[PDB]
Amino acid sequence: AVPAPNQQPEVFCNQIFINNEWHDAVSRKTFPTVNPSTGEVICQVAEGDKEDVDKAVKAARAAFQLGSPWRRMDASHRGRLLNRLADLIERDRTYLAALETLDNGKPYVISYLVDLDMVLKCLRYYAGWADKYHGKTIPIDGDFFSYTRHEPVGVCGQIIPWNFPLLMQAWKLGPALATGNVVVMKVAEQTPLTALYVANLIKEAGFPPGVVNIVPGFGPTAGAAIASHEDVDKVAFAGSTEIGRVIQVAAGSSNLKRVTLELGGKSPNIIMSDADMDWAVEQAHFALFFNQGQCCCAGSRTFVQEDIYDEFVERSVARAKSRVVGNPFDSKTEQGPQVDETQFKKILGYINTGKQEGAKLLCGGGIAADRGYFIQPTVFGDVQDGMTIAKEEIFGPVMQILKFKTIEEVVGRANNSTYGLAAAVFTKDLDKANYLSQALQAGTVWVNCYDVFGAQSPFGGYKMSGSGRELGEYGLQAYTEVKTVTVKVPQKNS
Amino acid sequence: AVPAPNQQPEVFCNQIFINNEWHDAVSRKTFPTVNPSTGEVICQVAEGDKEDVDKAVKAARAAFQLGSPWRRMDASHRGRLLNRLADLIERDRTYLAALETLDNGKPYVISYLVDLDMVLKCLRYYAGWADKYHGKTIPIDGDFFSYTRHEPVGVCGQIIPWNFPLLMQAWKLGPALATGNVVVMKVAEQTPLTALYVANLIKEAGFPPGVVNIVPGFGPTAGAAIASHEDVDKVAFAGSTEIGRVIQVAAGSSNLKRVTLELGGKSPNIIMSDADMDWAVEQAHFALFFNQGQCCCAGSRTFVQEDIYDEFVERSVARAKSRVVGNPFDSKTEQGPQVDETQFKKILGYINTGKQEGAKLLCGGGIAADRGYFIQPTVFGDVQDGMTIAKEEIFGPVMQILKFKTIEEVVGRANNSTYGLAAAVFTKDLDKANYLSQALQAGTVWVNCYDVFGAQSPFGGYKMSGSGRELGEYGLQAYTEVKTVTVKVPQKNS
Amino acid sequence: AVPAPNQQPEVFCNQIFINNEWHDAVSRKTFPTVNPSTGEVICQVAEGDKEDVDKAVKAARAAFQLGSPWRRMDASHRGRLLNRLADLIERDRTYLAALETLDNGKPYVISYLVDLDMVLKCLRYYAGWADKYHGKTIPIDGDFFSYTRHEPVGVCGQIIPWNFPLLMQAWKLGPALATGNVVVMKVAEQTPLTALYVANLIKEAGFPPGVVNIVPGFGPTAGAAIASHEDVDKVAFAGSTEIGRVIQVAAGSSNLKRVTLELGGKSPNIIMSDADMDWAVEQAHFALFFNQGQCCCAGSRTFVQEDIYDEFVERSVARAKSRVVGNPFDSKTEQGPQVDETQFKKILGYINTGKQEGAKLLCGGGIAADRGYFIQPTVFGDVQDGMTIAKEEIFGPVMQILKFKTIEEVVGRANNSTYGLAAAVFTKDLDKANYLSQALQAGTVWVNCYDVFGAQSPFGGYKMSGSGRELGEYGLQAYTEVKTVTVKVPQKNS
Amino acid sequence: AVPAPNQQPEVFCNQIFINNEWHDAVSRKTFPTVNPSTGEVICQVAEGDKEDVDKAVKAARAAFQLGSPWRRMDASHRGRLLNRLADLIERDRTYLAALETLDNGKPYVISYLVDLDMVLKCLRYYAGWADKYHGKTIPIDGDFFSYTRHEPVGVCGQIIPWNFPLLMQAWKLGPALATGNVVVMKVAEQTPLTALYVANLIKEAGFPPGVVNIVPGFGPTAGAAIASHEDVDKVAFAGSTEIGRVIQVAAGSSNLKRVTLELGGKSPNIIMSDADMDWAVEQAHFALFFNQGQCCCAGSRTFVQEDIYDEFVERSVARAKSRVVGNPFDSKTEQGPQVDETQFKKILGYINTGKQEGAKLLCGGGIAADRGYFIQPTVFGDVQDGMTIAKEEIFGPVMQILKFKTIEEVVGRANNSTYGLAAAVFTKDLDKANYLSQALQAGTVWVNCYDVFGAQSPFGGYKMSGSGRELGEYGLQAYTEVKTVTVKVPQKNS
Numbered sequence A, B, C, D: 001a002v003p004a005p006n007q008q009p010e011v012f013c014n015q016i017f018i019n020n021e022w023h024d025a026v027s028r029k030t031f032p033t034v035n036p037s038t039g040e041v042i043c044q045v046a047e048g049d050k051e052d053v054d055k056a057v058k059a060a061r062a063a064f065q066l067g068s069p070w071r072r073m074d075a076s077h078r079g080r081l082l083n084r085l086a087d088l089i090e091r092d093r094t095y096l097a098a099l100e101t102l103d104n105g106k107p108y109v110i111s112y113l114v115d116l117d118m119v120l121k122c123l124r125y126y127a128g129w130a131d132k133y134h135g136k137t138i139p140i141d142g143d144f145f146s147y148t149r150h151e152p153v154g155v156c157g158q159i160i161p162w163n164f165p166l167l168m169q170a171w172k173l174g175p176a177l178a179t180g181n182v183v184v185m186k187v188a189e190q191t192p193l194t195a196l197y198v199a200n201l202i203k204e205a206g207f208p209p210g211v212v213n214i215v216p217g218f219g220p221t222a223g224a225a226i227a228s229h230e231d232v233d234k235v236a237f238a239g240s241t242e243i244g245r246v247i248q249v250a251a252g253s254s255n256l257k258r259v260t261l262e263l264g265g266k267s268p269n270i271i272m273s274d275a276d277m278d279w280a281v282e283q284a285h286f287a288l289f290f291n292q293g294q295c296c297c298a299g300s301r302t303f304v305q306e307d308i309y310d311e312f313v314e315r316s317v318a319r320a321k322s323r324v325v326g327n328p329f330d331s332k333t334e335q336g337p338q339v340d341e342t343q344f345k346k347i348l349g350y351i352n353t354g355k356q357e358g359a360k361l362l363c364g365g366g367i368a369a370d371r372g373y374f375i376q377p378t379v380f381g382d383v384q385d386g387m388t389i390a391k392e393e394i395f396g397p398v399m400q401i402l403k404f405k406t407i408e409e410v411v412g413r414a415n416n417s418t419y420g421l422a423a424a425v426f427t428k429d430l431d432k433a434n435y436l437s438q439a440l441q442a443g444t445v446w447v448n449c450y451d452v453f454g455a456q457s458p459f460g461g462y463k464m465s466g467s468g469r470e471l472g473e474y475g476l477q478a479y480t481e482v483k484t485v486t487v488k489v490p491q492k493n494s
């Protein structure tokens, strides 16, 4: 059951979070964050820049000093603290879900039942990892005792996007804190509010000052300051490919900090002719339109086998037409607005391109309301591989349907991409399922499902969709620095 | 025993190795490689460049295609092929040890008993890993079966330095081939010969064409072409910090290939007053002077507790004065020449630097012979933390001895460095050992020993000494791309 | 701080727990449980036998059926329930600590600060494992996909002793429940009360009926019924070597159920001449006297190097004399009574044997009070390896101090035992600690400490002290049945 | 190709193997081993008894002493020695195959291409494990460093059966030796010869004296001596359920040695109506008839969906009717004789019972030759779950075919067995494959294949088919004893 939202939740936190305290920017500058449903300013937010990052990194560095409360704390107690954070987030769930919706635009029902659930499950999962990521004892040649310590990497810069503000925060904080790192987080200018409120809960949970610092602000300013910082040990970036490149170059040009990236995709969703029709149609709809189409791994190339194409297309158009666009706080609403005017206008431009390049417009194609950034659920049929809308990440409610004949054809066409974040296969055949799931060059392959995230199972890109993995045990790798200790012993025995 | 060397081994391979075949550069250009003991040209070698790299990468890509012999091959069979390569290397051990000495300058006894031994152990270790690096089955929420595939990362560019030509080749090839990758290797222009001979053995072992491709040539040409290549999935680099940066920048500016790095160090070797004096002196000598000082993890800061400083220095100077410099094919020789003229001059520069900034010249400090690139074993005493010779990698037979009072003091001074590749502690005390091994910010901490490498134990840098780890199970992480497969099932049960 | 105890806590649960309900024994029989401080009956408890075990196993089996709530439950939710259970135990901590003291005899301060803390930590540790114990994907030869499912073993019979009633229940429930198993637990007749109260909390926590079943009763009846049962898949037993044998025999004679055992010990505690004297003496006191001497891994052979023997003994005797025996509810009490009259009499008999065989009685030797099962802290000096008190587990406040000369000697003497549960080494020397910890034939070796249990570190016997390990990741092995699934695929690729 | 066999290979080894030397039985008694194809004696073999076992155990215990060659040997070198043993077995492959066939009865082509191949692959697989089975470093609470040593279990008794003499030896020796254990092996009285020759190869490979000891002889004599021995640390037994009980009982009644068992099966092979008919018929035939039906995990309940029952049965009969029985040395022979007269008679007895209990005899059912233990490939139709031949392991060329309607029905019928060694599923449907592999209570589930063994994938029984797993990483668990070392440190940091 979903509790009634406060459709205008109060903002308590809108500043820079350093040493468990709230600070204005050194410059005293602020920036507006907008409600995408109305285009109205919610409030002002402190505009962190390089000087503010510097304060945060110093705070983080001090928290990480040998002998500090956070360094000496039992690993099991890091788990306790993550679990306490989860509880606090659960206590403030109704509030946080409404705040998420206000700033981001996604339906409140979804914020509550999906985002907040996943946030809670991610943190509780990683709480369990805190005291279980063992190093090794190693049967080295000669008279030595050799072992590894799994130590934290240190000061971790974490730059996150706007599409799942709370969940992305949890994805980054969970594994970092489980392994005893400290954090300087740069949240998206489009959606700083919920992450800032969680910083209040981080302090309430009992985390030592400087363990988590949050600098709201812009990319080329606050973001780049972190990526280029001489005392940040590790950077994790989620967002556009373009800025992914900027991050890796910044790391190379500065102190050679360790780097992981989660970037976009143009993920293919493959519907074989022996698929369950109703299930396939609904899941393809979900795969594309989920979160206003603002999902890294959106199924934005829907490949359909020729024998079922006409039927699949018909049922897909009908479903897009029935999809309820409106006020995210209304319980009927399935699709809220796009995050901002920039994305709003980029999506419309993609639709213009789709039309002019000869794809068949089957429904939508225009603005869904005269207020806020609402776009009609749009479906293009007879899409070809060379078309812009088949190549570029649109990040909106714009569906691409492409026809194919053979299993070998679809494999090569799905893989003919410099992206490789995810892929999906809809089929009842065992061999086809296994053939495709092996042959597909993607970080995740869903079979008869889509967008199934589990804190237990890793996620990340092939090719230019990123590097490294998040979630599961693998999510701990990039947050661990490995030390070998090799000790001379009187006489080594098995 | 050691078999008598051929002091003038014949060169059989001096071209570019692609698809198991020997090729001239497209340009037909060649470059001389020099014997550092005599300063004379050994032979000419094909000068690979961008167009040659492109050929090598295309061949590697072809060998990596789905359904190729190398992709279809049983994992256990990759292990078989690695064990065979090792057998052939051992067959040619005496020849290869001489050729290594000729091209590189290190003592033949060392080439034979150390380098070649470690090459064999590395390959045989990784052979064993071929069919054991499991993925996971994962108890994900909901009605799903979730698992991961550990796939190869793909086309792997490997750019290696000159200080351990054969050993670096093996450190790179072992884990890459064990996990089913394909390789484009750029060997050092100073030392191309031994690795080109190994390529012949790679063909003899039965490796499919395109699996290993070797392009000798220079850095800004051949190496930069690998680093910037749009179809190289992963690059591994070992060398200078300067070029490390370039590599990471080129990776970021191109296709976001995955990057691991092994760079310099200024590793602290800490001698507590309770250490075994005779042992610590001899091991501190080895820690610095091993391989003409040309070791990434050389113990180039010798911190000695004040109570034993005077005696420690006296004994170190006598040991350095006794160290035999000469023809590396002569069995009495402890120390051969530096690798080339560039390094020779660089080291002479650092020696003069040390004298100018007021470090106490205790022995050596000059050119050791007329022909070749021989330098006297040199010891500086009363070295201070702020001195350039205390901060910068010298990569020559130049020893720094520093004085400290307390264990807390020495931790801070050892850690005060942008480098963090290795460290060592000499002590009889349980608590001192554990306190320091924990506190030292280094990839490897040796206790009462130095330069102890096991194929089983990982090695790599903290901070600007690099990122990632080689050797052990950890050496397989960077050579693996992870894929999650999540499958809808009728009813998930435990 | 420690909350004031209720010295007469009320009993709410004293029946058989099956399907989340309380039941009398089918025979309607009850047995008294006694307060060992007074010798007086606390209450009657339902006396379970074969008929009751049969009901419990059937409930367990039904709860374990494919498609049941417990089988379908997300592994992450099993973790939620374990965490909920821990929260509930924490809510009732002061009550549970007082009931533990009432029934067992251990000091309330210790029940509260140690046992209850460890219980909480054990369950919260295993909660985190629930969704993390991955199976494998395996690169088998040929055109196959091969993986392992880690399934629960099934119906687990758990027979637990009286010395740490709540803690042993947690050691058993944590791993078994985290892995999705179902339990029939036979608690000790001396200490059934606290475990029965926890069953109320298991129900309250929301564990499906039949998942945990608890049958109080005697050993030859209820316990043997579990061991011999044709539908119990796995038995874990903790107690005497003698009953350990009965268990393994019963399992081989019935259905070949899987068996793990934790049995007695005669663990050596080795004090080298370079040990810290004050610390060594205090820790050797703790090592022996902890929990009224009633600890499986009690340090019951104190080997002291001859040069420090005289002083060590003198201080140990002083410490044993100052040790406060009395009412376990009084804050000053260090030592409570022994658990029952049988143990009481057995210990006094072992004291007699010590006097008879010519060990030097240095303090204690008799009863400490005229009411309750209290025994004086007793120290024997000059113990010899052949004496009964040096060979057999006494399980009481009786300390054996033995003299040795060399490290080689003490290794042989320490390992000359059919037991091998634990051992310790007290020394400042790095090499001695490494030499000894390698050489000692024991499941746990402590260095400069004793009785350091962590939920993270495994615990278990060598030789006749048992088999298999509890705690840590290893504690899940016995609760897992492994299934290989091997699937034909069109064409296997790496 | 397959090299021509020597049809009367010479026996070089027929004694007891202790300390790398050949010994007569203390009693000087011998027993004959018979060629099952002719019924004639091959040679006499030393008849080992209790006293011979005592000698062997003492040799093994001496080899296992701390500081011995076997104990001090580098883990990597144990690997080298396993690899050398494999090389020697391959050298002698053609002879061993012929000798295997002479003593066992299986076709020479199978001996050469299957058994010998698998032996080589198993030994080489485990050679790679030797230096890779790491212990753990553990982030325990408090100021402690805690780690685990993976030490060998010790003296391992290994009692093996007669169906895969050479393969079972490798399955036991591979993991035991990889982890540094020592072995007392008791080979089957029916097939002692090939194992004794391998012992000669174990000496040639360089294994220290006492590391592997082999005692030929009878079960209630030599086998029981091993199971009851006070100085054997671990027993592994493969054979009947009946003796499996005896082994577990003896372990319990003696020194509480660790026990793993691999016992019988009545494995279900389930053919869904959507299976590939031609493939399933052939694989069902293989599943049952392989190795003269003498396979632990034989597909001895063939469940066939009603819609395809008639055709499947017809095709099965045609294949059984044309299966070539004859001289195992003839290239065309698919099926040799049963191993001995006792087996011969028991199988014919089961054929009688099958007829008597109302199963439809469709082909075969009698003796195939007038000398040797040759039985006609026999197929029973319309088998019911209640029939003896549906319940008991026949271990011969006797196929049972049962009819089913629904997937839910077949699950209950398959699992209604005290056995659970293996199962198979033949279907083209994704969901049915996943539904069944999860639901079936068996240690291995094959999908669209059968008898797919890989050194990489674990094998072992559920229920009364045994406990523990052989092969893969899992096969090392039983050969490892875990030691925790927990060290007090001045100040624990992450």
Ligand SMILES: NC(=O)c1ccc[n+]([C@@H]2O[C@H](COP(=O)([O-])OP(=O)(O)OC[C@H]3O[C@@H](n4cnc5c(N)ncnc54)[C@H](O)[C@@H]3O)[C@@H](O)[C@H]2O)c1
Residues within 6 Å of the ligand: D159, D160, D161, D162, D163, D186, D187, D188, D189, D217, D218, D219, D220, D221, D222, D223, D224, D227, D238, D239, D240, D241, D243, D244, D246, D247, D262, D263, D264, D265, D295, D296, D297, D393, D394, D395
């Ligand atoms: N699953 C298998 O791998 C397997 C193997 C062989 C036999 N079997 C089953 O057992 C039946 C009879 O065969 P079997 O009698 O040759 O097998 P078995 O179980 O009696 O003997 C197997 C091994 O154990 C030894 N052994 C026999 N009695 C022993 C005892 N009392 N104590 C210790 N060791 C003892 C034997 O010498 C042999 O080495 C067959 O029909 C078959 O069903 C199963």
Ligand SMILES: [Mg+2]
Residues within 6 Å of the ligand: A240, A243
């Ligand atoms: Mg941008």
Ligand SMILES: [Mg+2]
Residues within 6 Å of the ligand: B240, B243
């Ligand atoms: Mg350079």
Ligand SMILES: [Mg+2]
Residues within 6 Å of the ligand: C240, C243
């Ligand atoms: Mg008893």
Ligand SMILES: [Mg+2]
Residues within 6 Å of the ligand: D240, D243
């Ligand atoms: Mg028998």
Ligand code: NA
Residues within 6 Å of the ligand: A033, A034, A035, A036, A102, A103, A104, A189, A190, A191
């Ligand atoms: Na906003």
Ligand code: NA
Residues within 6 Å of the ligand: B033, B034, B035, B036, B102, B103, B104, B190, B191
């Ligand atoms: Na050279």
Ligand code: NA
Residues within 6 Å of the ligand: C033, C034, C035, C036, C102, C103, C104, C190, C191
């Ligand atoms: Na009691």
Ligand code: NA
Residues within 6 Å of the ligand: D033, D034, D035, D036, D102, D103, D104, D190, D191
């Ligand atoms: Na025989």
